[PDB]
Design a protein around this nucleic acid. Structure first.
Ligand SMILES: [Mg+2]
Ligand SMILES: [Mg+2]
Ligand SMILES: [Mg+2]
Ligand SMILES: [Mg+2]
Ligand SMILES: [Mg+2]
Ligand SMILES: [Mg+2]
Ligand SMILES: [Mg+2]
Ligand SMILES: [Mg+2]
Ligand SMILES: [Zn+2]
Lengths: 229, 175, 129, 146, 94
RNA sequence: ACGGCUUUUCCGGAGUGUAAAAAGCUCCGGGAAUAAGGGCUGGGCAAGGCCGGUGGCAGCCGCCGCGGUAAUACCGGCGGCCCGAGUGGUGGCCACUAUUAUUGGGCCUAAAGCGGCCGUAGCCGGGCCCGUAAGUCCCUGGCGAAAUCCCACGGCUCAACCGUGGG
């Protein structure tokens, strides 16, 4: 955990921020990822995450879901430009997902990985199945649903050891977030990975929109963010 | 209707060419030197059945679910796969590499009776090993715990003499 | 026309509180409505309520706390054996002890967690979580 | 649009009738209870047949292709009908003589019917005089009856 | 070969006794019938011509065989209730 | 390529086994000696940017799609990939299919709201109080053959198969 902890010490000098959160961070005031979120800020500098989540760039916490080239016609032929979809996250409690556009594949990948750090969220984990009744953060705490495009998803808790039973580009997103067991039930057209990816993302977000009592917490084990890494 | 037909005791993969699955099973075949894939899926099913049994006795209640509950820990730890004080929940955190450490091959190799795993197979199948005073010629027998110590050479085997030109190369490795 | 003054009540509650209201007036008021509210309050979902009479069936003043996700009515009112609750719980609620499943047993109205203690069954009527 | 029609407690009969009556608007279930495949089918519920050749022909391929596909006209035994079969392999049409007892399979396309550019052929030869056409086409075995 | 006898069970109706024993012989063939009969009639000092050896059989890789024999008080009783083929296999009658 | 080793399988031979045989099992003498094919190799889908033929012809193709003289897709050779005493082809049922939908589908513009309204059987029906006990719920007697299904233990070398108990 060292090379990804001197990285922040190198970055924290050559970076003279322009927004305000940049000032707060660079003056040692704000010092932990769990305290820029539930407060209504804006995030426009992608160096803030390199300093508080320095592992988000480790090439095994990165992922390239799809690449597709699109076209528009003109009186001098066709003008073709790419579209990439990419997700990033430490495999603990935080994820982000973005798109990016360009006219070559390294530039589209670069912008995608950028915009995937400015779209980051934290989730809730637990164990809410009927079979397993331990208290460990390996699964969703209770069934949630999220919709997008024309694609409805629903994520159901599952017992420890059963893998991830969902589509192909759901496994990457749910593995980068820390979830390890789940079930699933979908509808609509699940062949357009943009909409399928955005529905899974929205469900994971909606995880933290359900009201819980201070006693339901010590029955599912709900951890928010990291949980003793 | 129809009478009883006998049924297969294993299950294939759903799609036969998932890449990151072939590259995961390739490692276990080369490490324990199994003969064919059908020899490996047998054990994966042997484990999935345990998981599916301990997965129903946990959302259950009544008189007879109790009786069956403690008959799963009984075998599951008489066979060696659990310690002496484990609760029912531990059946859910088992792994394939814990069954494959109980075949007779691995145990005759993890005790110095052989030089290398692909030699213990011939040692067994030619009838030299002897589990609790009974020649056994099946390298995939799941050894219990109450007899793991009583594995030797056969009483009438050429290996059972500490001068055999082959039996002396064996401990030439234990150093 | 009016066929079910209980479904109307629970759907009106779930429409109101989803947008922010602090009070609702359940217009027709059986004793079955009040009998649901009695156990929907004990678990901590609503505030306090009283019966305002107006010479025609009365009303119900109920003030919310913003603490329910979804309420409704199990309409066909299936009967349940005493050992077969989980099967119906896996269709309505989202976890293994979430919410409540109101059952109309032979000794009043009570959540299923109190029916499995005495071991009884009865028609289902509604569900809150 | 309403809610859904018979959602009552004592409304079983109307519900079962609704479902039984709208199951017939299907086409795989209708084609099965009436047993319509049969009595329109020259092979009569079988996975092979045996016939006697009558002549040798060739067909034109589809619109965006070019070539001629060799084929034969077989006359069955159990019925007496005439079907058109297709000879697969490079140089098979050089073995099928007149007055041969050939065997006949399907061709395996969508819905049991035809496939590829050959549009109306739906049977393919496998055995000629009880020697697998596959072998004959690639050496490896000798042919009986001249 | 070394013989241990595991059960001598009497019989007052048929008038006989059943002898359940076992042979331990690592490195030698399955004993003959003449030889097992000799060892028995020397051990328990019976009549050597009324005792029959119903079976001796060897198990998979165990160097230990299981046998079972029957011995009669009267001669003709034996020659009356006993089947035919066993007397021939044991050579008594011909 | 040199050194050693084994005998499961293979030939002979002796016990045992069996109504008589044969298989099987225990001991002897020889010998590494007697024993791997089938389908794929453009994408879905693991695996070659190599060589020689063929020239919209021959052929391939479950669907999309290759071949017009510079073919990773046709025919061979050499390499490689998946299963392995098996491996491919053609017909039938289930899942795939929320393309039969009670759980759990649709009906402005995509398939689909009767041209409009009255009304018989049938399904659905406001509030309170007093009885009944048909529906519904719990306890207990008499039934729903054995085989078949799940589990533990025991017997054939483990196991398939068989037995004693609980469901
Ligand atoms: Mg080739
Ligand atoms: Mg590939
Ligand atoms: Mg539809
Ligand atoms: Mg009423
Ligand atoms: Mg029965
Ligand atoms: Mg035994
Ligand atoms: Mg057993
Ligand atoms: Mg039985
Ligand atoms: Zn768990």
């Amino acid at each position: 955990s060292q090379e990804w902890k001197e990285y922040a010490k190198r970055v924290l000098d050559e970076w003279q921020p322009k927004t305000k959160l940049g000032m707060l961070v660079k003056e040692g005031q704000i010092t932990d990822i769990h305290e820029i979120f539930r407060k209504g800020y804006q995030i426009k500098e992608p160096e803030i995450i390199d300093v508080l989540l320095p592992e988000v760039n480790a090439r095994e916490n990165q992922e390239i879901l799809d690449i597709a080239l699109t076209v528009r016609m003109t009186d001098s032929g066709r003008r073709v430009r790419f579209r990439v979809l990419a997700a990033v996250g430490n495999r603990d409690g935080y994820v982000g997902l973005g798109i990016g556009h360009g006219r070559e594949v390294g530039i589209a990948i670069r912008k995608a990985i950028n915009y995937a750090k400015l779209n980051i969220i934290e989730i809730k984990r637990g164990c809410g199945s009927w079979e397993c009744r331990c208290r460990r953060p390996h699964s969703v705490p209770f069934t949630v649903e999220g919709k997008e495009g024309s694609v409805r998803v629903k994520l159901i808790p599952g017992p420890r050891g059963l893998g991830l039973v969902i589509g192909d580009v759901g496994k990457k997103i749910l593995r980068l977030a820390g979830i390890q067991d789940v079930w699933s039930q979908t509808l609509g057209e699940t062949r357009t990975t943009v909409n399928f990816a955005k529905a899974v993302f929205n469900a994971l977000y909606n995880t933290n929109k359900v009201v819980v009592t201070p006693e339901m917490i010590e029955r599912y084990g709900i951890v928010v963010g990291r949980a003793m890494p | 209707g129809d009478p009883k037909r006998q049924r297969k005791k294993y299950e294939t993969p759903p799609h036969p060419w998932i890449k990151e699955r072939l590259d995961r099973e390739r490692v276990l075949m080369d490490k324990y030197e199994l003969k064919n894939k059908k020899e490996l899926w047998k054990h994966e099913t042997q484990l999935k059945n345990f998981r599916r049994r301990a997965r129903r006795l946990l959302a259950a209640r009544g008189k007879q679910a109790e009786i069956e509950r403690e008959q799963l820990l009984a075998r599951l730890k008489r066979l060696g796969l659990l310690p002496e004080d484990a609760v029912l929940d531990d059946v859910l955190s088992l792994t394939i590499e814990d069954i494959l450490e109980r075949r007779l091959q691995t145990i005759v190799y993890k005790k110095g009776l052989a030089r290398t795993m692909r030699q213990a197979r011939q040692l067994i199948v030619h009838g030299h090993i002897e589990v609790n005073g009974q020649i056994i010629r099946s390298p995939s027998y799941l050894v219990l715990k109450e007899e793991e110590d009583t594995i030797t050479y056969a009483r009438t085997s050429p290996f059972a003499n500490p001068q055999h030109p082959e039996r002396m190369m064996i401990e030439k490795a234990k150093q | 026309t009016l066929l079910d003054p209980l479904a109307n009540a629970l759907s009106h509650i779930t429409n109101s509180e989803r947008v922010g209201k602090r009070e609702v007036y359940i217009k027709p008021a059986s004793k079955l409505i009040g009998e649901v509210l009695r156990v929907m309050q004990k678990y901590g979902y609503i505030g306090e309520f009283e019966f305002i009479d107006d010479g025609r069936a009365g009303v119900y003043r109920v003030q919310l706390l913003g603490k329910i996700n979804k309420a409704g009515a199990i309409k066909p009112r299936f009967p349940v054996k005493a050992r077969d609750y989980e099967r119906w719980e896996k269709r309505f609620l989202p976890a293994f002890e979430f919410g409540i499943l109101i059952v109309s047993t032979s000794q009043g109205v009570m959540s299923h967690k109190e029916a499995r203690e005495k071991g009884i069954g009865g028609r289902l009527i509604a569900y809150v979580y | 649009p309403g809610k859904k029609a018979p959602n009552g407690e004592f409304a079983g009969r109307k519900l079962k009738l609704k479902r039984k009556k709208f199951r017939w608007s299907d086409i795989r279930y209708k084609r099965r209870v009436l047993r319509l495949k049969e009595k329109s089918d020259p092979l009569e519920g079988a996975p092979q047949a045996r016939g006697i050749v009558l002549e040798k022909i060739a067909v034109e391929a589809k619109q965006p292709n070019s070539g001629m596909r060799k084929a034969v006209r077989v006359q069955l035994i159990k019925n007496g009908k005439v079907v058109t079969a297709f000879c697969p392999g490079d140089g098979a049409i050089k073995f099928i003589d007149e007055h041969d007892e050939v065997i006949i399979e399907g061709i395996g396309g969508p819905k049991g019917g035809s496939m590829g550019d050959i549009p109306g052929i739906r049977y393919k030869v496998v055995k000629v005089n009880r020697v697998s056409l596959k072998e004959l086409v690639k050496g490896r075995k000798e042919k009986p009856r001249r | 070969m070394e013989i241990k006898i595991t059960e001598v069970k009497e019989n007052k109706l048929i008038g006989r006794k059943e002898i359940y024993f076992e042979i331990y012989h690592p490195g030698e063939p399955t004993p003959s019938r003449k030889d097992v009969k000799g060892k028995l009639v020397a051990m328990l000092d019976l009549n050597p011509e009324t005792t029959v050896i119903q079976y001796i059989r060897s198990y998979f890789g165990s160097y230990k065989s299981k046998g079972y024999a029957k011995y009669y008080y009267d001669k003709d009783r034996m020659l009356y209730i006993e089947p035919e083929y066993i007397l021939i296999r044991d050579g008594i009658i011909e």
